[PDB]
Every structure is written in structure tokens, then in C-alpha cells.
Ligand binder design. Structure first.
Ligand SMILES: [Au+]
Ligand SMILES: [Au+]
Ligand SMILES: [Au+]
Length: 129
């Protein structure tokens, strides 16, 4: 599914991401925009042979099992395909574990390079939240 901006803002807020570990909702919408273009079906191969999955591009190297990242972790205890659903629950509850692990939103390269330090409130402008 490809979310509308305000549609994803609404879902992320409902799932308890607004201000999660002090990251405003705008940070999460900005990350999702630049990670996946709001597309739950997004998959991208990493150089080490891991793959990033779903609307928040969660990495098989640490967080999920995709059956082809040998010697990796599965710290969210899910198949990476669960991260590709039209329903963002699994991506949200895994992202909460990632952002809590000491590195904050710096784990998301697109957030670091395109959202961090910017006016991220612009990403929720116009939305009825
Ligand atoms: Au959730
Ligand atoms: Au994020
Ligand atoms: Au949802």
C-alpha cells in the first residue's frame, strides 16, 4: 500500500510513534517519505547481502529473518515479509525497538541525511491529527 502523507501521520500517531523516545511525528513521516516513499512494499538490497523491508526500511542484518541473510540477527522476532503488510503495526512495533537501542533515529540513513536538523513539522502540516 502507498500511504498518503496525512494518512501515514494518522496511522503512526495511532500506533504511538508521536514523541516516541522524543522524536516528533514529523521525524517519523519524514523518515518514511525518504526511506520508502510511503510504500509498504519497498525492498532494497544492502551491500553486505542484507535487505531493508517496508515503509521504514528495517534491515534483515539485525531485526528480521528473510531466509537469505545468513549469520544475521532477528531482534524483532519476525519474518521480514511481516514488515511489508498494508498494516504498519509490525513495522511500528519493530521501529520502537530499533530507536530504543541507544542509536536513536540515526539507524535510518535517510532520516540522518534528509530529516535530522530540518523543519520536520512541515511533514504533518495540513493534517487533522
Ligand atoms: Au503499532
Ligand atoms: Au525512524
Ligand atoms: Au496501522
Amino acid at each position: 500500500k502507498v500511504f498518503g502523507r496525512c494518512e501515514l501521520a494518522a496511522a503512526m500517531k495511532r500506533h504511538g510513534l508521536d514523541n516516541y523516545r522524543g522524536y516528533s511525528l514529523g521525524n517519523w513521516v519524514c523518515a518514511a517519505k525518504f526511506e520508502s516513499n510511503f510504500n509498504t512494499q519497498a525492498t532494497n538490497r544492502n551491500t553486505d547481502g542484507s535487505t531493508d523491508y517496508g515503509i521504514l526500511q528495517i534491515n534483515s542484518r539485525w531485526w528480521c529473518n528473510d531466509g537469505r541473510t545468513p549469520g544475521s540477527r532477528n531482534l524483532c522476532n519476525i519474518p521480514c515479509s511481516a514488515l511489508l503488510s498494508s498494516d504498519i503495526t509490525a513495522s511500528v512495533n519493530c521501529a520502537k525497538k530499533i530507536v530504543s537501542d541507544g542509536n536513536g533515529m540515526n539507524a535510518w540513513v535517510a532520516w540522518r541525511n534528509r530529516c535530522k536538523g530540518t523543519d520536520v513539522q512541515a511533514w504533518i502540516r495540513g493534517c487533522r491529527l
